[PDB]
Design an enzyme around this catalytic site. Structure first.
Site, PDB file in Angstrom:
ATOM      1  N   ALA A 165      36.262  25.352  85.907  1.00 57.27           N
ATOM      2  CA  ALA A 165      37.656  25.782  85.969  1.00 57.27           C
ATOM      3  C   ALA A 165      37.879  27.112  85.265  1.00 57.27           C
ATOM      4  O   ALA A 165      38.733  27.898  85.684  1.00 57.27           O
ATOM      5  CB  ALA A 165      38.562  24.715  85.363  1.00 57.27           C
TER       6      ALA A 165
ATOM      7  N   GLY B 197      37.804  18.094  83.687  1.00 54.71           N
ATOM      8  CA  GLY B 197      36.366  18.049  83.870  1.00 54.71           C
ATOM      9  C   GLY B 197      35.615  17.865  82.565  1.00 54.71           C
ATOM     10  O   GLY B 197      36.107  18.184  81.485  1.00 54.71           O
TER      11      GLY B 197
ATOM     12  N   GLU C 293      39.582  10.864  84.618  1.00 54.88           N
ATOM     13  CA  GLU C 293      40.324  12.033  84.148  1.00 54.88           C
ATOM     14  C   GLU C 293      41.223  11.788  82.932  1.00 54.88           C
ATOM     15  O   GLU C 293      41.231  12.655  82.039  1.00 54.88           O
ATOM     16  CB  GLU C 293      41.120  12.628  85.321  1.00 54.88           C
ATOM     17  CG  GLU C 293      41.880  13.900  85.005  1.00 54.88           C
ATOM     18  CD  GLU C 293      42.652  14.419  86.202  1.00 54.88           C
ATOM     19  OE1 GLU C 293      42.050  15.118  87.042  1.00 54.88           O
ATOM     20  OE2 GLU C 293      43.860  14.122  86.306  1.00 54.88           O
TER      21      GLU C 293
ATOM     22  N   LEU D  47      48.335  39.851  69.267  1.00 56.60           N
ATOM     23  CA  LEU D  47      48.030  38.426  69.336  1.00 56.60           C
ATOM     24  C   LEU D  47      48.564  37.692  68.113  1.00 56.60           C
ATOM     25  O   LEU D  47      49.029  36.553  68.220  1.00 56.60           O
ATOM     26  CB  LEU D  47      46.524  38.212  69.491  1.00 56.60           C
ATOM     27  CG  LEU D  47      46.021  37.944  70.916  1.00 56.60           C
ATOM     28  CD1 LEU D  47      46.483  39.009  71.903  1.00 56.60           C
ATOM     29  CD2 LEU D  47      44.510  37.817  70.938  1.00 56.60           C
TER      30      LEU D  47
ATOM     31  N   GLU E  83      51.194  38.637  66.576  1.00 60.54           N
ATOM     32  CA  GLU E  83      52.648  38.743  66.690  1.00 60.54           C
ATOM     33  C   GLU E  83      53.275  37.418  67.107  1.00 60.54           C
ATOM     34  O   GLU E  83      54.052  36.816  66.356  1.00 60.54           O
ATOM     35  CB  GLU E  83      53.002  39.826  67.712  1.00 60.54           C
ATOM     36  CG  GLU E  83      54.297  40.618  67.507  1.00 60.54           C
ATOM     37  CD  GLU E  83      54.417  41.326  66.168  1.00 60.54           C
ATOM     38  OE1 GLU E  83      55.561  41.654  65.795  1.00 60.54           O
ATOM     39  OE2 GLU E  83      53.389  41.622  65.524  1.00 60.54           O
TER      40      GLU E  83
HETATM   41  N1  LIG Z   1      44.537  25.345  88.287  1.00 64.59           N
HETATM   42  C1  LIG Z   1      43.247  25.281  88.596  1.00 64.59           C
HETATM   43  N2  LIG Z   1      42.515  24.157  88.269  1.00 64.59           N
HETATM   44  C2  LIG Z   1      41.200  24.080  88.582  1.00 64.59           C
HETATM   45  C3  LIG Z   1      40.581  25.134  89.235  1.00 64.59           C
HETATM   46  N3  LIG Z   1      39.286  24.802  89.426  1.00 64.59           N
HETATM   47  C4  LIG Z   1      39.077  23.571  88.907  1.00 64.59           C
HETATM   48  N4  LIG Z   1      40.255  23.103  88.391  1.00 64.59           N
HETATM   49  C5  LIG Z   1      40.468  21.811  87.705  1.00 64.59           C
HETATM   50  O1  LIG Z   1      39.275  21.392  87.064  1.00 64.59           O
HETATM   51  C6  LIG Z   1      39.199  19.982  87.084  1.00 64.59           C
HETATM   52  C7  LIG Z   1      37.762  19.476  87.013  1.00 64.59           C
HETATM   53  O2  LIG Z   1      36.917  20.373  86.325  1.00 64.59           O
HETATM   54  P1  LIG Z   1      36.001  21.378  87.186  1.00 64.59           P
HETATM   55  O3  LIG Z   1      36.640  22.741  87.234  1.00 64.59           O
HETATM   56  O4  LIG Z   1      35.825  20.828  88.580  1.00 64.59           O
HETATM   57  O5  LIG Z   1      34.567  21.498  86.463  1.00 64.59           O
HETATM   58  P2  LIG Z   1      34.262  21.103  84.934  1.00 64.59           P
HETATM   59  O6  LIG Z   1      35.473  21.248  84.048  1.00 64.59           O
HETATM   60  O7  LIG Z   1      33.146  21.991  84.446  1.00 64.59           O
HETATM   61  O8  LIG Z   1      33.738  19.585  84.991  1.00 64.59           O
HETATM   62  P3  LIG Z   1      32.291  19.245  85.602  1.00 64.59           P
HETATM   63  O9  LIG Z   1      32.180  19.812  86.996  1.00 64.59           O
HETATM   64  O10 LIG Z   1      32.105  17.748  85.637  1.00 64.59           O
HETATM   65  O11 LIG Z   1      31.232  19.857  84.720  1.00 64.59           O
HETATM   66  C8  LIG Z   1      39.880  19.579  88.380  1.00 64.59           C
HETATM   67  O12 LIG Z   1      40.563  18.359  88.219  1.00 64.59           O
HETATM   68  C9  LIG Z   1      40.861  20.698  88.662  1.00 64.59           C
HETATM   69  O13 LIG Z   1      42.166  20.267  88.364  1.00 64.59           O
HETATM   70  C10 LIG Z   1      41.309  26.272  89.554  1.00 64.59           C
HETATM   71  O14 LIG Z   1      40.767  27.201  90.148  1.00 64.59           O
HETATM   72  N5  LIG Z   1      42.649  26.337  89.248  1.00 64.59           N
END
Ligand SMILES: Nc1nc2c(ncn2[C@@H]2O[C@H](COP(=O)(O)OP(=O)(O)OP(=O)(O)O)[C@@H](O)[C@H]2O)c(=O)[nH]1
Ligand SMILES: Nc1nc2c(ncn2[C@@H]2O[C@H](COP(=O)(O)OP(=O)(O)OP(=O)(O)O)[C@@H](O)[C@H]2O)c(=O)[nH]1
Ligand SMILES: Nc1nc2c(ncn2[C@@H]2O[C@H](COP(=O)(O)OP(=O)(O)O)[C@@H](O)[C@H]2O)c(=O)[nH]1
Ligand SMILES: Nc1nc2c(ncn2[C@@H]2O[C@H](COP(=O)(O)OP(=O)(O)O)[C@@H](O)[C@H]2O)c(=O)[nH]1
Ligand SMILES: [Mg+2]
Ligand SMILES: [Mg+2]
Lengths: 426, 111, 431, 431, 426
Positions: D12, D135, D175, D244, D246
């Site tokens: 993410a 995640g 989650e 930052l 601030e």
């Molecule tokens: N807003 C937003 N949320 C994201 C995005 N990409 C992933 N997420 C969120 O990330 C959550 C899960 O984590 P991931 O990004 O898939 O990967 P991770 O945190 O490294 O977890 P693992 O893949 O198990 O290692 C999902 O439930 C999404 O809600 C993004 O581009 N924008």
């Protein structure tokens, strides 16, 4: 946006839609293969009322063809406009009803209702907002009138507040083509009086009368008759697909026409129809269109409102027309005819206008009008039903399949009560 | 209690006559001129941003659809489009003349 | 500075509105794209940084077939797309459906866009709403539109331009049912409220404008000229300038009585304008004709309470007060003994502008009279009779009652209409 | 000399950081190879003597398929090849795996690059950590990442950007387990914690941007403009300049409450932006609209503590103070009685830079809003219910237990989180 | 980087994997000679997950084929893609099992698992970081059930912390083939409870119904049935080989769908399948793809999912699409089906999208669902084992090879405990 999903019931049910889907396909410029050949972009603006979208630019109708004899659908499928429908929509049984209402209601109804309600969930859930459903059938056979009464009862219960439009072909004494047709008609209208929002009463006497006396066709095969029925079916709900100066969709005609929930039987009629030779001496102006419209020759029912009282009147117009003329001609017929119209509802008529005319034509109109002349057809059907039931006629082909004998007397008590309501409102 | 040895061949002959009666779509790719949706491509994944051509027919359809009814049709089709059909001035618009064209004029004190 | 918000409600509102907004753009010299090829446009248009103008109009509709014709035509680039409010399903000629079931789904969207337009206003003179009594949510959603406006906004002006159901011609059966239940809202939550019925406008277009076959476009061009002459004192300099609040207070005798009658003069064709002169005295006498009145009621039966007049063009105050003296001398017209000085006069220099393709001709001197008479009781007891004649055998009650409103609310509209017709009877008696 | 380091941890953080660094590169006029075809770029880049610019970013992940697209993408020459740190096996949405048994092999590599990046800095301002609560890698590995940064850097500011798990939509089953254990680290080792969830971005992109189905690319470009607005004070001059430190003093009243809510205004498409007039006094209203909030919670239920406003472009200081006076006169917007000076203003001269292929509009005036409210109490109590509903009879616990963490740490995270939600109830009451 | 050693057992397993290596080499563009002839160079970014590099730019699969009859492999070697396998990995005995579970587990298994574990030791030690193993088998035969359960037991005690993946074809009553069929399935489920991380349940009844009613195929040859299974195996592990916005490999789905260690049985299904003539009558949208994924006709297990409660659901997508459409669709099916989904786990669904679909198709659907209707398969298997064991049917073949009679009582006690665990959480 607002959607009407089409349903069929029986051999007459499939043949009506076979001509109905042809006439509006040319109205929207769709070839038998299913492409688009149109000169106006306004046609495609509102086309999702009756057509679903598929990949590659395909439009498929939202019709469910129901029958118990597959020989009818094979003639439908081999027809010029039969390949457009998705093959999953055809629902068929293996044994027929045999023109018996009880066979199509209790015995073989329960094994085929699971299939048809499995399909109509897909035709309903797959869109944005439903306006209602549509059914066409005939009250003479046990196939269309059999589960056609009973398919409504579950789907009305599942979908409580929708619009249910029905086309019913009532049996007639002159075009009586079935011995057991009073048994079919009486127990179907009994279920229809409480399960149904609207119902149009079309009879084969008036269809024969218009094609013979007025249209002077020498050999009117039922395709020509189904041309006349489907033109009225298109003109009633043409406000769904085409904008106008004053519009009135199916729900607009729903509230205003019925004065009471138990009186939803109407008589359709159509105006611009003329003979092949009488066209060049005839003009198309609003008076000409309303002069021929309230004429009893062009009525599509076996009843005459001269003997009765117009409860509520309607007329849905089409073409390039001025507001004043549509209003001044209809004012005179209410004022001059002081006997045919009811006195406790003034300004009985609702009016709609549509800018887009049918092709090959400049002006058109569609008539719906509720009268107390409908009890002429109800009384003559009921007296034949009581005459045979007095002397134990044909009953063991209904009561031998597992049904009570006293359900008829409850249906007879419903039948004469309905015609009693039409007398006290007359 | 059905006979599956007959049901299977009923289905077989059904599918066979459907194969006989099947006629294919004649490859006239028609699309609505109103609206179709897009999916945004990836920033870094270079498997999405390949150089690739675009149709000009649908560009012409967009440029003809986003246009006025007078420019589309030679004569009017419906009645609701009649207002504003002829937008031309019958006399030239001499709005600069304060003599015959009285108008409100801003002042320096209110602003 | 001064500005108003137009609220075009219903299918009649859209067809009226595009007749009005076509007239406004050519009046202020604005092209359909919004950019011109002076603050006269400030009352209705809003200026942006790029040189455009956004009309201050909100279109309230419950059927998408009447909004998509606006989004397709020449004015698709003019209006801001969030100003056109479309419901999912129409009430289909039902006051109750647009009051309790259908109307509360989009009541939040209308009041939100009302907040945005009133935020841009530095000082708000009033609101104009356009609707018809006959239809479902033109009469139904307007009833709950006033309830939210009066509670939120205290003393802001809200004009109600309406179309009364004609005594003879109608396009519905539940049309008297919809009209009487709107008397509760208009009696309570309306600062001012006009009415013209369609049967009267039908008579004038046949005999004055020389049109054999007119449609609602030729009617709505006439109603656009009425609103244009009303608001032009706000938009242009005048020898006497009359504001929106000025004649609002000066026509109403009581808070229960805010129902004027609108007439316009002259209404002649471009071939008949070649023949007859149009002076100040000639157009003044034309507003008093019962034939040229735009409501099917006769002031010869009733008594005038007050009068408001709106002159445009080469109008001299000498000729205005000369023609008023002649009207008081004739004994066919009467005034109440408790209003000896009943007139109000306004003059604007700019002549009325004509539309291309319209029916009328360009005129120097025109007048738009706003007279409140006791002749409006003629057109109410007729409709109260027909509302009582249908409801005697208890017809069409199941559609309205089953949607949520109780059966006793129909009886509530009986007494409020019966008491309101009694308040008009006590005006006409002489002391 | 004011310099910051960005750390993208988990998947993410990568695509959110992907939207940032393609926006940052075009904001400074740099080619994709990293060489320009002014000392503003020194905040987020280091100038190699040969003439190439290197981002101050460390991309860390435990799965190779999300970083290998960056090593072969458009800016494959931009980053240092060693900064793109990639693990061997992913945590598989386990907070236990990414904190104890899998993240222990990569934590040694990442702290050396943080030390080598921070040794280059002549002056440090803060960190920028991007992840999500859902995640495993963005939760578990971030938990022991800041633990080591806390004992290495004493009073260093660390901005923590996190995607909050949406209440309705969810792409995982375990989650709610990850987010409760994650808050324990952020409660102690973070100075700020910016909360934005996915579900409210879905609705804002629908009605305002007029795109019905946004993907991650359209979601993260909205996130990138929020981060670019915060850092525009450091890189570019302004009438009022913030740091930052601030807003870290100015938005965090108590050490347990550092969870602001970030929204952006305007979000207008290019078709509509041709129409509206956009001014400073009207875009402040768009920040406080409950529909335009970037978090699925109702601000009208809660009470505001503080607000930080960051205006960009053609903004005059009279307009921001007129807009604040407009907001404080309204009654729907509520503030605590122990904070009358509840606002803060930041104005910069450079307008936001749009991206070719973006969905936004080229607007001079844009505003980023950072408030700390009591309306986020309902956004955690809805996720406090979900975790305790799982933990009623030990769902999915055996995967974490067999990894190497004990069973009592699930209750300790619940006890700390239940104590944290009681802090909002005791400070939200008036005195 | 992360590698899976594929392993095939028995006649049913070898024919399943032969189609599997034929269909995924099409995805990576590998000719039957073993070289590379493709169009997109992404096919070499992740190819070491399933392949071993050979000299001259040749790729060989990472598979071991075990059997006890040479009459199956010579058909596999004479097949289209039979020239890519290494001849060392072909391991077999000379004497057949005779469809006896005791033969492949006690009699002839102990002589061959010395050789088979030698081969798989070399394949697992040559990997970089082993993700786990893959096994295709059936629970009705001697080789598929007998040697297969022992072969997992030897693997687990050597490699304790991996991801063990097995595909099993569950025996069915209506397509019953062998007389000792409940004997084989009951003795093999006992080992699959405590020795594998996840098991996929496939019924032969569902494969026959799908290939005849939905696909409308004239000839359901075993290749066409195996083409249905092979689309599931390619779609589950597509996040290892194909990049995407949201990804989910084997271990991510391992934690999420297994709430308790004794519940690792799943029901797969595939969802872009279409009939012979409805190709052009279909719209490829995510709501269209979601409902057919959930459709009970498309379940690959011969039991009604409407008769039980879903524990967890995973949906693996393919093709270019936008996942705002994904999350709105999965909340619709959870909200409107309140009774079917469980209440102790909100948001039962997990999604994953990959950028590249299978060729010739725009979008693909992979369904994995954990339901409580799996007890219907196990109850029916348990009663057929109980009917045989009460009268001691066919026991003299199994007890004469050195296996005690008390082991069946321990197996059914272990299996009936698993069925009660399904009802305990239902
Ligand atoms: N807003 C937003 N949320 C994201 C995005 N990409 C992933 N997420 C969120 O990330 C959550 C899960 O984590 P991931 O990004 O898939 O990967 P991770 O945190 O490294 O977890 P693992 O893949 O198990 O290692 C999902 O439930 C999404 O809600 C993004 O581009 N924008
Ligand atoms: N004077 C005038 N009246 C109109 C016009 N158009 C419609 N009406 C009146 O409107 C009434 C019917 O309402 P509609 O035109 O259907 O519009 P509505 O009020 O929103 O009603 P719905 O369509 O059901 O929502 C009729 O009785 C007419 O009297 C017009 O152009 N001029
Ligand atoms: N109006 C009309 N009526 C028809 C047509 N075909 C049959 N009928 C009527 O339907 C009755 C017999 O219908 P039938 O075929 O038994 O209907 P089914 O049992 O539902 O298939 C006869 O009394 C006819 O009057 C037609 O094309 N038009
Ligand atoms: N899916 C599938 N099942 C098969 C195939 N061939 C046989 N079977 C099933 O396997 C069962 C017999 O298993 P068997 O071949 O004796 O297992 P083995 O002892 O390992 O060889 C039969 O009930 C068949 O239904 C095939 O090609 N595909
Ligand atoms: Mg309306
Ligand atoms: Mg990840």
């Amino acid at each position: 946006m607002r959607e009407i999903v089409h349903l069929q019931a029986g051999q007459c049910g499939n043949q009506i839609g076979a001509k109905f889907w042809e006439v509006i396909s040319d109205e929207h410029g769709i070839d038998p293969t299913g492409t688009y050949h149109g000169d106006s972009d306004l046609q495609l603006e509102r086309i999702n009322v009756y057509y679903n979208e598929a990949t590659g630019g395909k439009y498929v109708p939202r019709a469910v063809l129901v029958d118990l004899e597959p020989g009818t659908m094979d003639s439908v499928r081999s027809g010029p406009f039969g390949q457009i429908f998705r093959p999953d929509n055809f629902v068929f049984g293996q044994s027929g009803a045999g023109n018996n209402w009880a066979k199509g209601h209790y015995t073989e109804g329960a094994e085929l209702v699971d299939s048809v309600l499995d399909v109509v969930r897909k035709e309903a859930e797959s869109c944005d907002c439903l306006q209602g459903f549509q059914l066409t059938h005939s009250l003479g056979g046990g196939t269309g009138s059999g589960m056609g009464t009973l398919l409504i009862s579950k789907i009305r219960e599942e979908y409580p507040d929708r619009i249910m439009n029905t086309f019913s072909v009532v049996p007639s004494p002159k075009v009586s083509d079935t011995v057991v047709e009073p048994y079919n008609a009486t127990l179907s209208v009994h279920q229809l009086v409480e399960n149904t929002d609207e119902t149009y009463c079309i009879d084969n006497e008036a269809l024969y009368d218009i094609c013979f006396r007025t249209l002077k066709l020498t050999t009117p095969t039922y395709g020509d008759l189904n041309h006349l029925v489907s033109a009225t079916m298109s003109g009633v709900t043409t406000c769904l697909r085409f904008p106008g100066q004053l519009n009135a969709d199916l729900r607009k005609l729903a509230v205003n026409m019925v004065p009471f929930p138990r009186l939803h039987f109407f008589m359709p009629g159509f105006a611009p129809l003329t003979s092949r030779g009488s066209q060049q001496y005839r003009a198309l102006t609003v008076p000409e269109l309303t002069q021929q419209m309230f004429d009893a020759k062009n009525m599509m029912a076996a009843c005459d409102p001269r003997h009765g009282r117009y409860l509520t009147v309607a007329a849905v117009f089409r073409g390039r027309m001025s507001m004043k003329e549509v209003d001044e001609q209809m004012l005179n017929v209410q004022n001059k005819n002081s006997s045919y119209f009811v006195e406790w509802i003034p300004n009985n008529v609702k009016t709609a206008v549509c800018d887009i005319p049918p092709r090959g034509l400049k002006m058109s109109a569609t008539f719906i009008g509720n009268s107390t002349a409908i009890q002429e057809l109800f009384k003559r059907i009921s007296e034949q039903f009581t005459a045979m039931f007095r002397r134990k006629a044909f009953l063991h082909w209904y009561t031998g399949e597992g049904m009570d004998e006293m359900e008829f007397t409850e249906a007879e008590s419903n039948m004469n009560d309905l015609v009693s309501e039409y007398q006290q409102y007359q | 209690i059905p006979d599956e040895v007959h049901q299977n061949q009923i289905l077989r002959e059904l599918y066979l006559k459907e194969l006989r009666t099947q006629k294919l779509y004649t490859q006239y790719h028609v699309n609505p001129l109103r609206k179709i949706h897009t999916v945004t491509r990836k920033p870094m994944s270079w498997h999405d941003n390949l150089e690739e051509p675009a149709d000009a027919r649908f560009l012409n359809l967009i440029h003809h659809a986003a246009q006025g009814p007078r420019k589309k049709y030679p004569e009017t089709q419906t009645e609701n489009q009649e207002v504003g059909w002829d937008l031309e001035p019958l006399i030239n618009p001499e709005r600069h003349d304060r003599r015959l064209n009285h108008f409100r004029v801003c002042s320096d004190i209110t602003l | 500075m001064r500005e108003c918000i137009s609220i075009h409600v219903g299918q009649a509102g859209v067809q009226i509105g595009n007749a009005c907004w076509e007239l406004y753009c050519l009046e202020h010299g604005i092209q359909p794209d919004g950019q011109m090829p002076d603050d006269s446009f400030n009352t209705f248009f809003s200026e942006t940084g790029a040189g455009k103008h956004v009309p201050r109009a909100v279109f309230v509709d419950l059927e998408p077939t009447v909004i998509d014709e606006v989004r397709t035509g020449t004015y698709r680039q003019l209006f801001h797309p969030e100003q056109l409010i479309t419901g999912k399903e129409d009430a289909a000629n039902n006051y109750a459906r647009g009051h309790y079931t259908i109307g509360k789904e989009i009541i939040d969207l209308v009041l939100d866009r009302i907040r945005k337009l009133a935020d841009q206003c530095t000082g708000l003179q009033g609101f104009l709403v356009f609707h018809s009594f006959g239809g479902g949510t033109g009469s139904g959603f307007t009833s709950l539109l006033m309830e939210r406006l009066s509670v939120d906004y205290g003393k802001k002006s809200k004009l109600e331009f309406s179309i009364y159901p004609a005594p003879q011609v109608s396009t519905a059966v539940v049309e008297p049912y919809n009209s009487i239940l709107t008397t509760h809202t208009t009696l309570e939550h309306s600062d001012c409220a006009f009415m013209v019925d369609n049967e009267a406008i039908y008579d004038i277009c046949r005999r004055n404008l020389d049109i054999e076959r007119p449609t609602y476009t030729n009617l709505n061009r006439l109603i656009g000229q009425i609103v244009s002459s009303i608001t032009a004192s706000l938009r242009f300099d005048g020898a006497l300038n009359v504001d929106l609040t000025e004649f609002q207070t000066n026509l109403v005798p009581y808070p229960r009585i805010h129902f004027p009658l609108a007439t316009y003069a002259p209404v002649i064709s471009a071939e008949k304008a070649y023949h007859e002169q149009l002076s100040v005295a000639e157009i003044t006498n034309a507003c008093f004709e019962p034939a040229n009145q735009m409501v099917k009621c006769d002031p010869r039966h009733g008594k005038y309470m007050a009068c408001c007049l709106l002159y445009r063009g080469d109008v001299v105050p000498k000729d205005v007060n000369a023609a008023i003296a002649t009207i008081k001398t004739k004994r066919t017209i009467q005034f109440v003994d408790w209003c000896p000085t009943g007139f109000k006069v306004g003059i604007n220099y700019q002549p009325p502008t004509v539309v291309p393709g319209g029916d009328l001709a360009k005129v120097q001197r025109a007048v738009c009279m706003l007279s409140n008479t006791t002749a409006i009781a003629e057109a109410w007891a007729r409709l109260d009779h027909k509302f009582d004649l249908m409801y005697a055998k208890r017809a069409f009650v199941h559609w309205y009652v089953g949607e949520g409103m109780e059966e006793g609310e129909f009886s509530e509209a009986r007494e409020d209409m019966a008491a309101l017709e009694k308040d008009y009877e006590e005006v006409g008696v002489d002391s």
